[PDB]
Coordinates of all heavy atoms in Angstrom, one line a residue:
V262 N 0.8 -1.1 0.0 CA 0.0 0.0 0.0 C 0.9 1.3 0.0 O 1.8 1.4 0.8 CB -1.0 0.0 1.2 CG1 -2.0 1.1 1.1 CG2 -1.9 -1.3 1.0
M263 N 0.6 2.2 -0.8 CA 1.3 3.4 -1.2 C 0.6 4.7 -1.3 O -0.5 4.6 -1.8 CB 2.3 3.1 -2.3 CG 3.2 1.9 -2.1 SD 4.7 1.7 -3.2 CE 6.0 2.6 -2.1
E264 N 1.3 5.7 -1.2 CA 0.9 7.0 -1.7 C 0.3 7.0 -3.2 O 0.9 6.4 -4.1 CB 2.1 8.0 -1.8 CG 1.9 9.4 -2.1 CD 3.2 10.1 -2.0 OE1 4.3 9.6 -1.7 OE2 3.3 11.3 -2.2
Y265 N -0.8 7.6 -3.3 CA -1.5 7.5 -4.6 C -1.0 8.8 -5.5 O -1.1 9.9 -5.1 CB -3.0 7.5 -4.6 CG -3.8 7.6 -5.8 CD1 -3.8 6.7 -6.8 CD2 -4.4 8.9 -6.1 CE1 -4.5 6.9 -7.9 CE2 -5.3 9.1 -7.2 CZ -5.2 8.1 -8.1 OH -6.0 8.2 -9.3
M266 N -0.6 8.5 -6.6 CA -0.1 9.4 -7.7 C -1.1 9.7 -8.8 O -1.3 8.7 -9.6 CB 1.3 9.0 -8.2 CG 2.4 8.9 -7.0 SD 2.6 10.4 -5.9 CE 3.1 11.7 -7.2
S267 N -1.7 10.8 -8.7 CA -3.1 11.1 -9.4 C -3.0 11.2 -10.9 O -4.0 10.9 -11.6 CB -3.7 12.4 -8.8 OG -2.9 13.6 -8.9
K268 N -1.7 11.5 -11.4 CA -1.5 11.7 -12.8 C -0.9 10.4 -13.5 O -0.7 10.6 -14.7 CB -0.7 12.9 -13.1 CG -1.4 14.2 -12.8 CD -2.8 14.3 -13.5 CE -3.6 15.5 -12.8 NZ -4.9 15.5 -13.7
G269 N -0.7 9.5 -12.7 CA -0.2 8.3 -13.4 C 1.3 8.3 -13.7 O 2.1 9.1 -13.3
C270 N 1.8 7.3 -14.6 CA 3.2 7.2 -14.8 C 3.7 8.2 -15.9 O 2.9 8.7 -16.7 CB 3.6 5.7 -15.2 SG 2.8 5.3 -16.9
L271 N 4.9 8.7 -15.7 CA 5.5 9.7 -16.5 C 5.4 9.6 -18.0 O 5.0 10.5 -18.8 CB 6.8 10.2 -16.0 CG 7.6 11.2 -16.8 CD1 6.9 12.6 -16.7 CD2 9.1 11.2 -16.2
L272 N 6.0 8.4 -18.6 CA 5.8 8.0 -19.9 C 4.6 8.3 -20.5 O 4.5 9.0 -21.5 CB 6.1 6.5 -20.1 CG 7.1 5.9 -21.1 CD1 6.6 4.5 -21.5 CD2 7.2 6.7 -22.4
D273 N 3.5 7.8 -20.0 CA 2.0 8.0 -20.4 C 1.7 9.5 -20.4 O 1.1 10.0 -21.5 CB 1.1 7.2 -19.6 CG 1.2 5.7 -19.8 OD1 2.2 5.2 -20.3 OD2 0.1 5.0 -19.6
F274 N 2.0 10.3 -19.4 CA 1.9 11.8 -19.3 C 2.6 12.4 -20.4 O 1.8 13.4 -21.0 CB 2.4 12.2 -17.9 CG 1.9 13.5 -17.5 CD1 0.7 13.6 -16.9 CD2 2.7 14.6 -17.7 CE1 0.3 14.9 -16.4 CE2 2.3 15.9 -17.2 CZ 1.1 16.0 -16.5
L275 N 3.7 12.1 -20.6 CA 4.6 12.7 -21.5 C 4.1 12.5 -23.0 O 4.1 13.5 -23.8 CB 6.0 12.2 -21.4 CG 7.1 12.7 -20.4 CD1 8.4 12.1 -20.7 CD2 7.0 14.3 -20.6
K276 N 3.5 11.2 -23.2 CA 3.2 11.0 -24.6 C 1.6 11.2 -25.0 O 1.4 11.3 -26.1 CB 3.7 9.7 -25.2 CG 3.3 8.4 -24.4 CD 4.4 7.3 -24.6 CE 3.6 6.3 -25.5 NZ 4.1 6.4 -27.0
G277 N 0.9 11.5 -23.8 CA -0.5 12.0 -24.0 C -0.9 13.4 -24.3 O -0.1 14.2 -24.9
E278 N -2.1 13.8 -23.8 CA -2.7 15.2 -24.0 C -1.7 16.2 -23.3 O -1.6 17.4 -24.0 CB -4.0 15.4 -23.5 CG -4.8 16.5 -24.3 CD -5.7 17.3 -23.4 OE1 -6.6 16.6 -22.7 OE2 -5.8 18.5 -23.5
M279 N -1.0 16.0 -22.3 CA -0.1 17.0 -21.6 C 1.2 17.3 -22.4 O 1.6 18.3 -22.6 CB 0.2 16.6 -20.2 CG -1.1 17.0 -19.3 SD -1.6 18.7 -19.3 CE -3.1 18.6 -20.3
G280 N 1.7 16.1 -22.9 CA 3.0 16.1 -23.7 C 3.2 17.4 -24.6 O 4.2 18.0 -24.5
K281 N 2.1 17.6 -25.3 CA 1.9 18.7 -26.2 C 2.2 20.1 -25.8 O 2.6 21.0 -26.5 CB 0.6 18.6 -26.8 CG 0.1 19.8 -27.7 CD -1.2 19.4 -28.5 CE -1.9 20.6 -29.0 NZ -1.1 21.5 -29.9
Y282 N 1.9 20.4 -24.5 CA 2.1 21.7 -23.8 C 3.4 21.8 -22.9 O 3.7 22.9 -22.6 CB 0.9 22.2 -23.1 CG -0.5 22.0 -23.8 CD1 -1.3 20.8 -23.7 CD2 -0.8 22.9 -24.8 CE1 -2.5 20.8 -24.5 CE2 -2.1 22.8 -25.6 CZ -2.9 21.8 -25.4 OH -4.0 21.7 -26.1
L283 N 4.0 20.8 -22.5 CA 5.1 20.7 -21.7 C 6.3 21.3 -22.4 O 6.4 21.1 -23.6 CB 5.6 19.3 -21.3 CG 4.6 18.7 -20.3 CD1 4.9 17.3 -20.2 CD2 4.4 19.5 -19.0
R284 N 6.8 22.2 -21.8 CA 8.0 22.9 -22.4 C 9.2 22.7 -21.7 O 9.2 22.0 -20.7 CB 7.5 24.4 -22.7 CG 7.8 24.9 -24.1 CD 6.6 24.9 -25.0 NE 6.2 23.6 -25.5 CZ 5.2 23.3 -26.2 NH1 4.5 24.3 -26.9 NH2 4.9 22.0 -26.5
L285 N 10.3 23.3 -22.2 CA 11.6 23.0 -21.4 C 11.7 23.3 -20.0 O 12.2 22.5 -19.0 CB 12.8 23.5 -22.2 CG 14.1 22.9 -21.8 CD1 14.5 21.4 -22.3 CD2 15.3 24.0 -22.2
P286 N 11.1 24.5 -19.6 CA 11.2 24.8 -18.1 C 10.5 23.7 -17.3 O 10.9 23.4 -16.2 CB 10.5 26.1 -17.9 CG 10.7 26.9 -19.2 CD 10.8 25.7 -20.2
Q287 N 9.3 23.3 -17.7 CA 8.6 22.3 -16.8 C 9.3 21.0 -17.0 O 9.2 20.2 -16.2 CB 7.1 22.0 -17.5 CG 6.1 23.3 -17.4 CD 6.4 24.4 -18.4 OE1 6.8 24.2 -19.5 NE2 6.2 25.7 -18.0
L288 N 10.0 20.7 -18.1 CA 10.6 19.3 -18.3 C 11.9 19.2 -17.3 O 12.0 18.3 -16.7 CB 10.8 19.1 -19.7 CG 9.5 18.8 -20.5 CD1 9.6 19.2 -21.9 CD2 8.7 17.5 -20.3
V289 N 12.7 20.3 -17.4 CA 13.8 20.5 -16.4 C 13.5 20.5 -15.1 O 14.2 19.8 -14.3 CB 14.6 21.8 -17.0 CG1 15.7 22.0 -16.0 CG2 15.2 21.4 -18.3
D290 N 12.4 21.0 -14.6 CA 11.9 21.0 -13.2 C 11.6 19.5 -12.8 O 11.8 19.2 -11.6 CB 10.7 22.0 -13.0 CG 10.2 21.8 -11.7 OD1 10.5 22.5 -10.7 OD2 9.2 21.0 -11.4
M291 N 10.8 18.9 -13.8 CA 10.5 17.4 -13.5 C 11.9 16.7 -13.2 O 12.0 15.8 -12.4 CB 9.7 16.9 -14.6 CG 8.3 17.5 -14.7 SD 7.4 17.1 -16.2 CE 6.6 15.6 -15.9
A292 N 12.9 17.0 -14.1 CA 14.2 16.3 -14.2 C 14.8 16.4 -12.8 O 15.3 15.6 -12.2 CB 15.2 16.7 -15.3
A293 N 14.9 17.7 -12.3 CA 15.3 18.1 -10.9 C 14.7 17.5 -9.7 O 15.4 17.2 -8.7 CB 15.1 19.7 -10.7
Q294 N 13.4 17.1 -9.8 CA 12.6 16.4 -8.9 C 13.1 15.1 -8.8 O 13.4 14.5 -7.7 CB 11.1 16.5 -9.1 CG 10.6 17.9 -9.0 CD 9.2 17.8 -9.2 OE1 8.2 17.4 -8.4 NE2 8.7 18.5 -10.4
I295 N 13.2 14.4 -10.0 CA 13.7 13.1 -10.1 C 15.2 13.0 -9.6 O 15.5 12.0 -8.7 CB 13.6 12.4 -11.5 CG1 12.2 12.5 -11.9 CG2 14.1 11.1 -11.7 CD1 11.9 12.6 -13.4
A296 N 16.0 13.9 -9.9 CA 17.4 14.0 -9.5 C 17.3 14.1 -7.9 O 18.3 13.6 -7.3 CB 18.1 15.4 -9.9
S297 N 16.5 15.0 -7.3 CA 16.3 15.1 -5.9 C 16.0 13.9 -5.1 O 16.6 13.5 -4.2 CB 15.2 16.2 -5.5 OG 15.1 16.2 -4.2
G298 N 14.9 13.2 -5.6 CA 14.6 11.8 -5.1 C 15.8 10.9 -5.3 O 16.2 10.1 -4.4
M299 N 16.6 10.9 -6.4 CA 17.8 10.0 -6.5 C 18.9 10.5 -5.8 O 19.7 9.6 -5.5 CB 18.1 10.0 -8.1 CG 17.1 9.1 -8.9 SD 17.0 7.3 -8.3 CE 18.4 6.8 -8.2
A300 N 19.1 11.7 -5.5 CA 20.1 12.3 -4.6 C 19.9 11.6 -3.2 O 20.8 11.3 -2.5 CB 20.0 13.7 -4.5
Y301 N 18.7 11.5 -2.7 CA 18.4 10.9 -1.5 C 18.8 9.4 -1.4 O 19.4 9.0 -0.6 CB 16.9 11.0 -1.1 CG 16.4 10.1 0.2 CD1 16.6 10.6 1.4 CD2 15.8 8.9 -0.1 CE1 16.3 9.8 2.5 CE2 15.4 8.2 1.0 CZ 15.7 8.6 2.2 OH 15.2 7.8 3.2
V302 N 18.4 8.7 -2.5 CA 18.8 7.3 -2.7 C 20.3 7.1 -2.8 O 20.8 6.2 -2.2 CB 18.1 6.8 -4.1 CG1 18.8 5.4 -4.5 CG2 16.7 6.8 -4.0
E303 N 21.1 8.1 -3.2 CA 22.5 8.1 -3.2 C 23.0 8.4 -1.9 O 24.0 7.7 -1.5 CB 22.8 9.3 -4.1 CG 24.3 9.5 -4.4 CD 24.5 10.6 -5.5 OE1 24.2 11.8 -4.9 OE2 24.9 10.4 -6.6
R304 N 22.4 9.3 -1.0 CA 22.9 9.6 0.3 C 22.7 8.3 1.1 O 23.5 8.1 2.1 CB 22.1 10.7 0.9 CG 22.6 12.0 0.3 CD 22.1 13.4 1.1 NE 20.6 13.3 1.2 CZ 19.8 14.0 0.3 NH1 20.2 14.6 -0.8 NH2 18.5 14.0 0.6
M305 N 21.6 7.5 1.1 CA 21.3 6.4 1.6 C 22.1 5.2 1.1 O 21.9 4.1 1.8 CB 19.8 6.1 1.5 CG 19.0 7.2 2.1 SD 19.2 7.3 3.9 CE 18.2 5.8 4.3
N306 N 23.0 5.3 0.3 CA 23.8 4.1 -0.3 C 23.0 3.0 -0.9 O 23.4 1.8 -0.9 CB 24.7 3.6 0.6 CG 25.7 4.7 1.2 OD1 25.9 5.0 2.5 ND2 26.3 5.5 0.3
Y307 N 21.8 3.4 -1.6 CA 21.1 2.5 -2.4 C 21.2 2.7 -3.9 O 21.8 3.5 -4.3 CB 19.6 2.7 -2.1 CG 19.2 2.0 -0.7 CD1 19.4 2.6 0.5 CD2 18.6 0.7 -0.8 CE1 19.0 2.1 1.6 CE2 18.2 0.2 0.3 CZ 18.4 0.9 1.6 OH 17.9 0.3 2.8

């Protein structure tokens, strides 16, 4: 049982109706969030 993510998986989002309006600033911000999550994973030695 986990936190519910309302917009689904990123691949689907990127390739669907939203993909069309996402521009570089939003895409780079998303990348930064994934980096941030992955930075934690890195700190924890996983």
Side-chain angles (χ1 to χ4, degrees):
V262 183
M263 304 198 86
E264 181 176 3
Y265 170 73
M266 301 303 301
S267 59
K268 292 304 168 183
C270 65
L271 173 69
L272 226 210
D273 291 25
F274 195 83
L275 279 181
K276 60 206 251 104
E278 209 211 313
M279 287 300 109
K281 174 167 162 53
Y282 306 104
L283 294 171
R284 225 100 292 183
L285 198 74
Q287 297 74 38
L288 291 155
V289 174
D290 179 88
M291 294 169 90
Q294 295 179 67
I295 302 152
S297 174
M299 286 303 309
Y301 167 83
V302 169
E303 184 179 69
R304 287 186 307 268
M305 298 297 282
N306 305 129
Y307 283 85

